[PDB]
């Protein structure tokens, strides 16, 4: 499969999440995603085919993971925006107030701004600390997906948000949205990963 930020993958033939970013770990191909999406050794599929397995994850406390891929996968420095692509150019962290977008299999490509940092989410499994917050909308299934600026600086991966009874927060105003992402930089250093760029 071609590995593009925002696309759907399944975990152990059950849950669906979204790809974060193509990465390498030496000769090993991978993608980063959210930790709550899968447990270590869980099998990832795209287009019905096995593409790899969860190599490592921290959740709760943090919310991060990477999936180690078979050599047959094609890593791409891209995030889905409809039928088009945003090129991944680096991982410069944007400040509060910056515009940012996110990509995932449920709500697609959505934009907003970064509204806060160092936010704690209290999930059913426990607290996750240190999250960044934006007001781009999102929904169930977007977890793991890319957060990236329009200039191509990868920000993080989708963790969670204040979804409403329809499964998303797109039906409430931006001023009322809390859409939380795990910062990319600590994921890259914790696992020794390099971002695939173009």
Q: Measured over all CA atoms, what is the biggest interatomic distance in the chain, rounded to whole angstroms?
A: 44
- Tell me the technique behind this structure: X-ray
Burial, 14: exposed, middle or buried (Cβ in 10 Å; 0-12, 13-18, 19+)? exposed
Instruction: List Cα–Cα distances, 114 to 25, 29, 47, 59, 88, in angstroms.
Output: 29, 30, 33, 23, 19
DSSP 8-state class, residue 42: P
Instruction: List Cα–Cα distances, 54 to 66, 106, 144, 183, in angstroms.
Output: 6, 22, 13, 19
Taking Cα atoms as reference points, which of 184, 121, 180 lies closest to residue 156? 184
The active-site residue, picked from 143, 146, 159, 178, is 143
CA pair distance 183, 68, nearest whole angstrom: 20
DSSP 8-state class, residue 188: H
The H-or-E segment that residue 146 falls in is strand 146-148
Helices (H), the chain: 184-191
The H-or-E segment that residue 117 falls in is strand 108-123
Q: Which phi and psi angles does 62 have, rounded to 5°?
A: -110, -175
Catalytic, 36? Answer: yes
Catalytic, 146? Answer: no
Catalytic, 143? Answer: yes
Q: Look at residue 183 and give its three-state secondary structure.
A: strand
For the chain, list the domains and their CATH numbers: 3-76+184-196 (2.40.10.10), 77-183 (2.40.10.10)
The active-site residue, picked from 10, 18, 63, 146, is 63
CA pair distance 119, 62, nearest whole angstrom: 11
DSSP 87-104: EP-B-PPPPTT-EEEEEE
The active-site residue, picked from 10, 22, 36, 91, is 36
CA pair distance 103, 149, nearest whole angstrom: 11
Taking Cα atoms as reference points, which of 140, 9, 12, 135 lies closest to residue 80? 9
Which pairs with CB-CB distance under 8 Å and at least 24 residues apart come from 10-13?
Answer: 10/44, 10/45, 10/46, 11/37, 11/38, 11/42, 11/43, 11/44, 11/54, 12/38, 12/42, 12/43, 13/43, 13/45
CA pair distance 154, 185, nearest whole angstrom: 9
């Amino acid at each position: 499969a071609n590995i593009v930020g925002g696309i759907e993958y399944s975990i152990n033939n059950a849950s669906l999440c979204s790809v974060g970013f193509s990465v390498t770990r030496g000769a090993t191909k991978g993608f980063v995603t959210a930790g709550h999406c899968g447990t270590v050794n869980a099998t990832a599929r795209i287009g019905g085919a096995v593409v790899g397995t969860f190599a490592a994850r921290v959740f709760p406390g943090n919310d991060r993971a990477w999936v180690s891929l078979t050599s047959a996968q094609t890593l791409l420095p891209r995030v889905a925006n409809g039928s088009s692509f945003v090129t991944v150019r680096g991982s410069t962290e944007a400040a509060v107030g910056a515009a940012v977008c996110r990509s995932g299999r449920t709500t697609g490509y959505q934009c907003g701004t970064i509204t806060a940092k160092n936010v704690t989410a209290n999930y059913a499994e426990g607290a996750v600390r240190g999250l960044a917050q934006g007001n781009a909308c999102m929904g169930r299934g977007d977890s793991g997906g890319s957060w990236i600026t329009s200039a191509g600086q990868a920000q993080g991966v989708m963790s969670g948000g204040n979804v409403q009874s329809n499964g998303n927060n797109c039906g409430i105003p931006a001023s009322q949205r809390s859409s939380l992402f795990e910062r990319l930089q600590p994921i890259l250093s914790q696992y020794g990963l390099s971002l695939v760029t173009g």
